[PDB]
Design an enzyme around this catalytic site. Structure first.
Site, short mmCIF file in Angstrom:
data_model
loop_
_atom_site.label_atom_id
_atom_site.label_comp_id
_atom_site.label_asym_id
_atom_site.label_seq_id
_atom_site.Cartn_x
_atom_site.Cartn_y
_atom_site.Cartn_z
N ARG A 45 6.25 -24.24 17.56
CA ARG A 45 7.10 -24.92 16.60
C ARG A 45 6.41 -24.98 15.24
O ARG A 45 5.21 -24.71 15.13
CB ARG A 45 7.43 -26.33 17.11
CG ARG A 45 8.35 -26.31 18.33
CD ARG A 45 8.47 -27.67 18.99
NE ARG A 45 9.32 -27.61 20.17
CZ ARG A 45 9.54 -28.63 20.99
NH1 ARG A 45 8.99 -29.82 20.78
NH2 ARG A 45 10.33 -28.45 22.04
N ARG A 138 6.30 -56.41 24.74
CA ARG A 138 6.57 -55.19 23.98
C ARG A 138 8.04 -54.81 23.96
O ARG A 138 8.41 -53.87 23.25
CB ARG A 138 5.72 -54.03 24.53
CG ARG A 138 5.90 -53.72 26.00
CD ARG A 138 5.05 -52.51 26.38
NE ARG A 138 5.61 -51.75 27.50
CZ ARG A 138 4.96 -50.79 28.14
NH1 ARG A 138 3.72 -50.45 27.81
NH2 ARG A 138 5.57 -50.15 29.14
N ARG A 149 8.15 -51.86 37.52
CA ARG A 149 6.80 -51.68 37.01
C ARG A 149 5.82 -52.63 37.67
O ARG A 149 4.71 -52.24 38.03
CB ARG A 149 6.78 -51.86 35.49
CG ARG A 149 7.28 -50.66 34.72
CD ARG A 149 7.05 -50.83 33.23
NE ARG A 149 7.44 -49.64 32.48
CZ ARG A 149 6.69 -48.56 32.34
NH1 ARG A 149 5.49 -48.48 32.90
NH2 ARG A 149 7.15 -47.53 31.64
N1 LIG Z 1 -6.04 -56.92 26.09
C1 LIG Z 1 -4.74 -57.29 26.11
N2 LIG Z 1 -4.38 -58.59 26.09
C2 LIG Z 1 -3.10 -58.97 26.12
N3 LIG Z 1 -2.06 -58.11 26.15
C3 LIG Z 1 -2.27 -56.77 26.17
C4 LIG Z 1 -3.66 -56.28 26.16
N4 LIG Z 1 -3.60 -54.93 26.19
C5 LIG Z 1 -2.29 -54.60 26.22
N5 LIG Z 1 -1.49 -55.69 26.22
C6 LIG Z 1 -0.01 -55.65 26.26
O1 LIG Z 1 0.40 -54.46 26.95
C7 LIG Z 1 1.19 -53.62 26.10
C8 LIG Z 1 0.76 -52.17 26.25
O2 LIG Z 1 -0.58 -52.14 26.71
P1 LIG Z 1 -1.46 -50.81 26.51
O3 LIG Z 1 -2.63 -51.14 25.61
O4 LIG Z 1 -0.50 -49.70 26.16
O5 LIG Z 1 -2.00 -50.56 28.00
P2 LIG Z 1 -1.60 -49.23 28.82
O6 LIG Z 1 -2.21 -48.11 28.01
O7 LIG Z 1 -2.23 -49.44 30.17
O8 LIG Z 1 -0.09 -49.23 28.82
C9 LIG Z 1 0.96 -54.11 24.68
O9 LIG Z 1 2.15 -53.99 23.89
C10 LIG Z 1 0.58 -55.56 24.86
O10 LIG Z 1 1.75 -56.37 24.79
#
Ligand SMILES: Nc1ncnc2c1ncn2[C@@H]1O[C@H](COP(=O)(O)OP(=O)(O)O)[C@@H](O)[C@H]1O
Ligand SMILES: Nc1ncnc2c1ncn2[C@@H]1O[C@H](COP(=O)(O)OP(=O)(O)O)[C@@H](O)[C@H]1O
EC number: 2.7.4.8
Lengths: 196, 196
Positions: A45, A138, A149
């Protein structure tokens, strides 16, 4: 073999914090980590470059090396193949970088069957309720997907206790706490990547 | 039976636009649609109310009606049960509201086996590339999960062609276009819900 830092396999339930931990790891260690470049048979692309965005190959070549066992993951849709080759992982290792493999549980067992010798790390929430609070925050889930989940995360947490599956299991109660544990687990491979 | 508007079963690949279409449908038809209240065996949390957030029941009662075939979906983790009962769907219908069931493909076939008589609608992207552009835009996917989603969406699009499975298949090329098709498919049930 392939000299260089051992790759890192990062797994755990989505929403537990493995992306937040990984982003901080990258932002505090530039030039140390790398991501494998995927193979595909689809057309390039605009702006894409071979060896950087994908390795563009024919279906015949990609199928041959799938049968040879190169690909720790692969998929196909709309007539095009996609996958991650152990050779692409070793190519990051050859550059004296820690190759980061962010995969689910099936990816872990696929990597376990290769000649790769990575470090296997699981990032788990402190509880299913904390993960629910994290997932509800989120605003990405229906009620069906949220409960699916949480149930899937339960099996993920249970499989993390399987002997020898993971070298390190990090319980993400405090983020600064979990990140420090992640750095300590990778401290020797980071030191090797810091060599010229 | 249960008099009232027929429920609507909304399905399709995640990221194709079924949430955007649903939100606009709700915001332009207040008092017309409703969502079933789920059953659970876990303890109530602060601010939660029975009959509004959940129907709180014992495990013995919930298991009995699962065996009776009430639950179009159910799951369990940490010793607590969760599920959506056909009776909770009929309770929304009893209020002269269109009950909205946003479920995946397995949910569709579970609903097909009940005495419910909903309208089955599938919202599909115009192409897998558009869905990829849509998924890359929201910045929620790894490379593993993005490719897994596209592959799973292919099977979702293929199963949507199965005869008699869906009453309406909406191709979300233009959102205003897809929304108008959604309203027309529900126009008779909306009219029934508009009655006193
Ligand atoms: N250390 C943390 N403390 C509280 N909430 C978290 C933390 N890490 C992630 N979250 C919550 O999880 C969501 C996504 O987490 P993420 O960092 O993407 O973990 P993964 O990569 O396992 O999905 C975030 O939008 C947040 O709301
Ligand atoms: N009509 C649309 N046109 C373009 N992109 C869309 C459209 N609907 C959704 N998307 C993309 O898909 C993502 C999520 O879509 P969503 O409305 O949640 O559909 P679904 O409920 O099937 O996941 C959005 O963040 C957006 O980037």
């Amino acid at each position: 073999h392939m000299s260089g830092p051992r790759p890192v396999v990062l797994s755990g339930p989505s929403g537990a914090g493995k992306s937040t931990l990984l982003k901080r790891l990258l932002q505090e260690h530039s030039g140390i980590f790398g991501f494998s470049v995927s193979h595909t048979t689809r057309n390039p692309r605009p702006g894409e470059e071979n060896g950087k965005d994908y390795y563009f190959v024919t279906r015949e070549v990609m199928q041959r090396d799938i049968a040879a066992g190169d690909f720790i993951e692969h998929a196909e849709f709309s007539g095009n193949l996609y996958g991650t080759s152990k050779v692409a992982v070793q190519a990051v290792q050859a550059m004296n970088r820690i190759c980061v493999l962010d995969v689910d549980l099936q990816g872990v067992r696929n990597i376990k069957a290769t000649d790769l010798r990575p470090i296997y790390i699981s990032v788990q929430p402190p509880s299913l309720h904390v993960l629910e609070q994290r997932l509800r925050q989120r605003n990405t889930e229906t009620e069906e997907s949220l409960v699916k989940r949480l149930a899937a995360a339960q099996a993920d947490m249970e499989s993390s206790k399987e002997p020898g599956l993971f070298d390190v299991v990090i319980i993400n109660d405090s983020l600064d706490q979990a990140y420090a544990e992640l750095k300590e687990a990778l401290s020797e491979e980071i030191k090797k990547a810091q060599r010229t």
